Symmetry: D2
Subunit: 187 residues, 4 copies
């Protein structure tokens, strides 16, 4: 197979290495949310921001030995008004209220941490029982944000990577692995 002949210069994470780590995260999450959630009577809620972390959440929930529910949000940026925001525009809000719920924010990659900071603070205002963050990838510039990511899959260098949900102009998401683009693509 191939799909994108030459666009991928180097391979950061292989497909097996990704799935192996996800299996580890599931057991870890499964142990942290064992006892509690199934007795509470309300499952572990997985809130996902469209649409990079869709491939990640489908594998994660099936890696978590505890029953999990899905929830999806669609957000867009208010343009360049990012730097002093970090407020993002909501295109599709939560379907139901998350009051008294154990909620796990599932992202695929955390770079700046500003859209995540607003999202995490936004969900907190809805008063859930628990709120933690699980990301597949974390880049160096996340150390400059104020949010604690309880579950991290991989710490990668500050390079633009695609694959496994990660895109460049809506492409390379269907890749099973995560790698770096070859700069003769940006044109």
């Amino acid at each position: 197979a191939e799909l994108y002949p030459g666009d991928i210069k180097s391979v950061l994470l292989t497909a097996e290495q990704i799935q192996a780590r996800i299996a580890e995260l599931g057991e870890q999450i499964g142990n942290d949310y064992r006892e509690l959630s199934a007795t509470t009577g309300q499952d572990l809620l997985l809130i996902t921001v469209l649409k990079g972390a869709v491939l990640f959440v489908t594998d994660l929930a099936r890696a978590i030995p505890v029953p999990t529910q899905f929830e999806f949000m669609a957000v867009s940026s208010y343009g360049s008004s990012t730097s002093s925001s970090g407020v993002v525009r909501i295109l599709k809000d939560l379907d139901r209220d998350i009051h008294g719920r154990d909620v796990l924010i599932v992202e695929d990659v955390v770079d700046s941490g500003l859209t995540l900071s607003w999202l995490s603070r936004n969900l907190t205002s809805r008063n859930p029982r628990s709120l933690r963050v699980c990301t597949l990838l974390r880049k160096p510039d996340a150390v400059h944000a104020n949010v604690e990511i309880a579950y991290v899959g991989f710490d990668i260098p500050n390079d633009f990577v695609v694959g496994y949900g990660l895109d460049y102009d809506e492409r390379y998401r269907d890749l099973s692995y995560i790698g770096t683009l070859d700069p003769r693509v940006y044109q």
Copy 2:
């Protein structure tokens, strides 16, 4: 119009416009040094769809330049009618960062959706945030939001007209009154 549905007229069309002209004049004076000081005008944020009739008259009563902004929200439970947490179906079109913002309501009853809205918009970091409502019920007088501009203080009866509805009707009324028999 609506024969035999309207029992009494609480507020006439004349009383509404007279107050809005007065309310508009008050707001226009409070936000007078805004064009010359920031240069972004006063933003009127409106929640669909009751206060749509009110803002069109309110903004045209305010002598200083005003901008329009609309939100569409829905109730979850049980959740809203106790928490005040509301669902967003349409967020703001632009960022209100560093803006002088006026939340324009048609009626404030419990004051919790207003509480959630005011707290939500605050996270967007505006320069100033005040609330202007046309009607105010008794339970709102003791809520967690400060309403700088109030049009009328009304008793807690279910009233329709001037944007206020019952099953999407009576919105087009120019006066505000109460329903009676088999409605």
Copy 3:
């Protein structure tokens, strides 16, 4: 007030209200005996955010009971400008199946987004579907969809006022005029 922004005034506030007053009676006569026969009211569907100021005056000019509906639409870019296919940010709150619906626009320029919109609402199978716009540009007479009610015929120039904007400004004007290109 906008002291150095309005070069010329195309339509005065009196002329605007006069046509709307005429349109309300005209629409009111075309939709006479509708509530008592169907059992439903005339639904006014509005596209945010130009015709929001227009419908509040239009509905209050129509002597028969009317209901409100609002849509928020966005451009895909490139493809809207030449297709007219638009993104939906806010759909109708209720279904319009078997309803007599009046599409209310603020201005009809190309007629491409209106044509797509008309087809979208038609697929929901309403009883009737007509279009009422306050302003119509010369190149809008071109093709597709019947605009049953037109308030004014304006030249194809960019005008602001009475809901019409330039970067969310000049909306609060009671009149419709032309901007000075040094804006």
Copy 4:
């Protein structure tokens, strides 16, 4: 187990699902062998299916998601909570469904996307029920034809639960 006493019988096992998706991916890849194949998915039942489907399709695929709500208790007209991010003009579009039962929401959707004038528009569903024979849509790709019983698992839910199941099975009537 995951839900002790809720799953009475297993209709399709996890391995049987992935094996069939592998065939669907291979079949679709040959039919669409100019940009990428656009996979339009309706939130949120078919999210587990499309992620596995796209990784089964040997040709490059792009993702798109819609959120729709029902107006109530006829024509398949649904309220749009989340529209497409981009226009699909001249695009090869594949509608990815989780289950096709009545075929009424799919028909409104298929006709709606057709109005955006794509180059191609096809429908791929994992499961199809017997009453779909009366639908208005031609479904080119079907994973399984299942009986008219209420099934959960692999995206399919009951009060937002059992979505995380890797298999598809039937519920225990002391759940309703």
